[PDB]
Design a protein around this nucleic acid. Sequence first.
DNA 1: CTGCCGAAGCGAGCACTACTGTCACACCTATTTTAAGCCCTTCAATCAAATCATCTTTTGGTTAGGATA
Length: 71
Amino acid sequence: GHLEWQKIAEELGTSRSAFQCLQKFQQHNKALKRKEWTEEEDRMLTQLVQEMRVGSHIPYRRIVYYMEGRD
DNA sequence: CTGCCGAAGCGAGCACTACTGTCACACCTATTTTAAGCCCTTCAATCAAATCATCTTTTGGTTAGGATA
């Protein structure tokens, strides 16, 4: 279930640890790197942009702290 | 017309280190020779702290490997 990555590393059998396995998976996890879009992400992105943006300047990536699976 | 002697307030003795006239002998330095240790300067050889140049780790945006909504 993408959980207990110590067990995942042990099952891998190449002497990897949980942290390395998780790092590699997250760097190649479609669920994390959101090529997709969701309604709540769009709504909250619009809300934060409208709250903060002045003129043509918006906090393009500082919104990522609030919305998951982004950069 | 001059002169004696009282009343009250004072007082005593007991309770089983600054100068000056001399004076000779100290102070003082003329140099020799070591043997290991001296203080300060003064520059030179070596060092290490800080700064610059460039490779690289990651933080916002564009590209065409890559994808949903």
